[PDB]
Amino acid sequence: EALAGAPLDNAPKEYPPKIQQLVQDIASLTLLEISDLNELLKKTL
């Protein structure tokens, strides 16, 4: 395996793709699941 390329701040434009897919997965949920997701996070954290 290999690690990341260590992007710099001179041309910082590429965000991690794992974050982006988490945004899409979160946005793909109903408001009822928002409360369930919130309550589980509050209980754990």
């Binding site: 690690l3 990341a4 701040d9 919130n38």
Partner: protein, 154 residues
């Protein structure tokens, strides 16, 4: 002889045998790269013996340790490992900083107290950072603060 042996191709290369000392460094590097969450590299600079010992004492106050490994047994090990991207940082003189429960707020402050001790980079929790990344990581809040604000934004 018809042809001088120097001009002839070299004989088959004898298999070099790794001694105990070399193998001892191999596992220690593996150990220090396994159970430690923060691995900060630095350019080792020839300082005063009293000043060097003082730096050890000051880093001891924050549970930060520093070790030195020769490139003869470190470059081949990191090449086969998952931290191969740190090879350009291990070309010349180097110094390694090791810490548990990473916290660079008290580490950069000591580094900035001496203007001639560069901070090249390092890997924090399997993530390679530059000096600017370390500075941004220093100003960043802790896990409890960030996660505590995470639920607020959601």
């Amino acid at each position: 002889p018809t042809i001088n042996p120097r001009c002839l191709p070299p004989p088959p290369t004898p298999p070099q045998e790794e001694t105990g000392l070399v193998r001892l460094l191999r596992r220690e590097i593996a150990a220090v790269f396994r159970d430690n969450r923060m691995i900060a590299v630095c350019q080792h600079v020839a300082l005063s013996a009293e000043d060097k010992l003082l730096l050890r004492h000051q880093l001891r106050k924050h549970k930060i340790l520093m070790k030195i490994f020769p490139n003869q047994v470190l470059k081949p090990f990191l090449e086969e490992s998952k931290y191969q991207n740190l090879l350009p940082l291990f070309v010349g003189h180097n110094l390694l900083l090791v810490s548990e429960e990473p916290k660079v707020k008290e580490m950069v402050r000591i580094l900035k107290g001496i203007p001639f001790l560069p901070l090249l980079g390092g890997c924090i929790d399997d993530t390679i950072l530059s000096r600017q990344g370390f500075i941004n990581y220093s100003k960043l809040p802790s896990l409890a603060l960030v996660q505590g604000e995470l639920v607020g934004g959601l």
